């Protein structure tokens, strides 16, 4: 049994990017939330494909051909080329930095929305531990856990045993 959202990643979870980790008396395990991870994979591969596909590539031939009394035009050609080099490197480096920053927050935002999406179901039937985990106030078997990952968690049915466990502290 290990932590979540506020804490690190899971090498044990290999069937997606974001997912759930349960622990109960019948055993422990990871399961990926495939609808979240697909959306993210689609989004980031679209990000890469936008960075690549919107480049205008024309046929150009860079060639230095000026004589010894054309050094001024050579110098102008050199100014021009250099300027385009400086522009493109600055823009590319800063583009990857800025987009890399956005890609990582996106991943974090997706994680926190998944946490909210199960917190709003669980409500009082569980204790927020402050680390991406909920400790159920009742017993939650494997079908209860896939109910919660599916979004089909019957709150009411467990209030029965929950309020009793809460009062017991």
């Amino acid at each position: 049994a290990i932590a979540g959202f506020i804490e690190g990643g899971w090498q044990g979870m290999v069937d997606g990017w974001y997912g759930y980790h349960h622990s109960n008396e019948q055993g422990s395990g990871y399961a990926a939330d495939k609808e979240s991870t697909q959306k993210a994979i689609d989004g980031v591969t679209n990000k890469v494909n936008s960075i690549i596909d919107k480049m205008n590539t024309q046929f150009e031939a860079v060639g230095r051909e000026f004589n010894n009394l054309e050094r001024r035009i050579e110098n102008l050609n050199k100014k021009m080329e250099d300027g385009f080099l400086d522009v493109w490197t600055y823009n590319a480096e800063l583009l990857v930095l800025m987009e890399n920053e956005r890609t990582l927050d996106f991943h974090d935002s997706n994680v926190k929305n998944l946490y909210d999406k199960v917190r709003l179901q669980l409500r009082d039937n569980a204790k927020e531990l402050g680390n991406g985990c909920f400790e159920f106030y009742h017993k939650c078997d494997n079908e209860c856990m896939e109910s919660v990952r599916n979004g089909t968690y019957d709150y009411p049915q467990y209030s029965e045993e929950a309020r009793l466990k809460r009062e017991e502290i």
Binding site: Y20, N24, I52, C133
Partner: protein, 321 residues
């Protein structure tokens, strides 16, 4: 009984930089900077380049005796020159508007050498005696193959008045020259006439050259000079030469049609029977990344040249188990 929300972690040590964070390890990354080439030289959209071994464009068109390997090919996408060819003008002199010509010949669609003024047809001048030690072929004094160095025959040099109508229907690249001799005596040994000229006229061209007889340093042992000129004769137009000495007449012209434009890349890397859409003087690059750092002097549809070592985009999550 617990349930926790979390993300994937793996055995990746790929690192990416953020605008706020440096050296961040991720699950998956994607490099958008091309850094791999062929190492060879290749075709360009199914068109081979024109490889000039040691021979220069000047030596190739004029027909320098020491480089007659490439006189076949009728199509090319660009020209490959050595950084400093050793065979260009064996006889010292100058090639007028040279850079403009090799830009023009940077990429030719159809190119066919033809004879326009046959050497036989110089009835009253000495054609086969215009050779020198500065242009050796076979160790024997030679001269440019595609132009004829005429000299007086039987102590006379009658005024030449030859013309040529462009009977073809592609443009013709015609070259000619003038020999700057060293003194009046030499001048009159080769030609009879002491003061000479060369008149060249087309529709656009209105040229007359006179020899500059001065004293100059020896180059390839010779202190004379030979200056060459060229023009594009359009279909149905005619070129009119006139001269009483120091003339370097054309024997062959070049049928020429060019649509696209290329550039002369200086490289010594060998041709590898491979195709590419983008080529550099150290190898070709067959990638569709937006950026490359291989070499600035690229020719074709290449990616943007940047001054970067890597341009990695994060695609995976932060790798922290």
């Amino acid at each position: 009984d617990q349930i926790c929300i979390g993300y994937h972690a793996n055995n990746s040590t790929e690192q990416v930089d953020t605008i706020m964070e440096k050296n961040v390890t991720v699950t998956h990354a994607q490099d958008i900077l091309e850094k791999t080439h062929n190492g060879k030289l290749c075709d360009l959209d199914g068109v081979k380049p024109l490889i000039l071994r040691d021979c220069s464009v000047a030596g190739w068109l004029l027909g320098n005796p020491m480089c007659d390997e490439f006189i076949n090919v009728p199509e090319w996408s660009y020209i490959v020159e050595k950084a400093n060819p050793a065979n260009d003008l064996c006889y010292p002199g100058n090639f007028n508007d040279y850079e403009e010509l090799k830009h023009l010949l940077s990429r030719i669609n159809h190119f066919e050498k033809i004879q326009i003024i046959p050497k036989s047809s110089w009835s009253d001048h000495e054609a086969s005696s215009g050779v020198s030690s500065a242009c050796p072929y076979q160790g024997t004094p030679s001269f440019f193959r595609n132009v004829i160095w005429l000299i007086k025959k039987n102590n006379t040099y009658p005024t030449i008045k030859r013309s040529y109508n462009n009977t073809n229907q592609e443009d013709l690249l015609i070259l000619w020259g003038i020999h700057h001799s060293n003194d009046a005596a030499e001048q009159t040994k080769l030609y009879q006439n002491p003061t000479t000229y060369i008149s060249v006229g087309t529709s656009t061209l209105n040229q007359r050259l006179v020899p500059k007889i001065a004293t100059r340093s020896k180059v390839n042992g010779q202190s004379g000079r030979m200056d060459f000129f060229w023009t594009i004769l359009k279909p149905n137009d005619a070129i009119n030469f006139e001269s009483n000495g120091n003339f370097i007449a054309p024997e062959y012209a070049y049928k020429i049609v060019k649509k696209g434009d290329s550039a002369i890349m200086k490289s010594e890397v060998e041709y590898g029977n491979c195709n590419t859409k983008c080529q550099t003087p150290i190898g070709a690059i067959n990638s569709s990344m937006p950026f490359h750092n291989i070499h600035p002097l690229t020719i074709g549809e290449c990616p943007k040249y940047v001054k970067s070592n890597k341009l990695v985009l994060a695609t995976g999550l932060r790798n922290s188990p």
